[PDB]
Amino acid sequence: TSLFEPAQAGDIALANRIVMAPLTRNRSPGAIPNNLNATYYEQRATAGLIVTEGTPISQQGQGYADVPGLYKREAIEGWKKITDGVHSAGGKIVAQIWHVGRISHTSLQPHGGQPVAPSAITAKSKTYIINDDGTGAFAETSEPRALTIDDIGLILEDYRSGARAALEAGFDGVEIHAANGYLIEQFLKSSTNQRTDDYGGSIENRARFLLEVVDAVAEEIGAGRTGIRLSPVTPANDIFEADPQPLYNYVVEQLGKRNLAFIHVVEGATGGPRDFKQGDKPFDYASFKAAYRNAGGKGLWIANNGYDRQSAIEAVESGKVDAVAFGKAFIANPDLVRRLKNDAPLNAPNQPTFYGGGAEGYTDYPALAQ
Ligand SMILES: Cc1cc2nc3c(=O)[nH]c(=O)nc-3n(C[C@H](O)[C@H](O)[C@H](O)COP(=O)(O)O)c2cc1C
Ligand SMILES: O=Cc1ccc(O)cc1
């Protein structure tokens, strides 16, 4: 199996196994994708699969400024232009449906309310907010409110609508964002979940919310078009779990029963060391993937974090992974696939232009000279 050869992820056919990782860019003010966003995605449409930046299912689920959502009619219309452009270049694309949970700020919340979370525990994290004078800034996340079961019922509805919106927007499917210390992970991990109801305590209970979201999304659009991103040991957004193995093995066992399109795994600290660990024992990725496969899981296995060309080729050849997702490399390289194919040099990413702004450091990264 080669990195550059076609794959299948549920009902979604991919021209190759080079994937564009989801990348929050904060360039859709008013939660609506614009013409510049459409250009940015079109440039990268040679990717076998594009996973969009995080796109929240609600304003409640928004944690960062100028992030395109799926809850406005105008946003749906804006995404349709993005998906039409990607498809015209023969690409494929899935929306990363998002809910940030406690990673948010009152200024972004409806009614300036408290961000929502399974337990009222404030993250020591930061979000990207825009001042009235336009300047972007990083600010401490706000105090969260503990969700009730009714709140949870409402969020589940927002997922159904979100998924429905993505289909209406012309997306090939969705990736459920269950990674990087956001809402779903907040339920999953012990440092964020101190609930005493059916959503707290045991592994089964902590995974309950994740599985409801998956079942809700898949019911709406098809299991064959539903994927999910996981990050077993990431320290992103002040989150921690002492026993990731039993928890995460149990999760993929359940996902293995659900005929999903893909499992997308952040290996290690998100944007950090691949060999990061939480708790006493190092995470066992082979045992993890085995739990998925052994439960019957046929989803395409997409791995991410700190991969380069050679390691990506070897990862796929060995059969450890089915496909590789690149984040920063795809920021810097619209034509990343061609460059990898021909082993051409790669542009360096400009970290100061990751978030907010305009075309600079977004749509002005050069393609190869041809
Ligand atoms: C600017 C930037 C924005 C990101 N936004 C998201 C996001 O919205 N959702 C997500 O799941 N991961 C996001 N990530 C994480 C990446 O998808 C990926 O996990 C990380 O960049 C490590 O991959 P890499 O070594 O290929 O760059 C973001 C990373 C960067 C650098
Ligand atoms: O802005 C960085 C970022 C990283 C991971 C996510 O899941 C979302 C945003």
Author numbering: 2 to 371
Publication text:
We determined the crystal structure of the enzyme NerA, which has been shown to exhibit dual ene-reductase and nitro-reductase activity with α,β-unsaturated nitro compounds, from A. radiobacter. NerA exhibits a TIM-barrel fold typical for OYE-like proteins, and all catalytically important active site residues are conserved.
The structures of NerA in complexation with 4-hydroxybenzaldehyde and with 1-nitro-2-phenylpropene were determined at 2.3 and 2.5 Å resolutions from orthorhombic crystals (space group P212121). The previously determined apo structure was used as the search model for molecular replacement. Both soaking structures had one molecule present in the asymmetric unit. The overall B factors were higher than in the apo structure, and the overall structures were identical to the apo one. Like in the apo structure, weaker density was observed for the loop β3 region in both complex structures. The electron density for the soaked inhibitor 4-hydroxybenzaldehyde allowed fitting of the compound with the aromatic ring placed parallel to the si-face of the FMN isoalloxazine ring and the hydroxy moiety bound between residues H178 and N181.
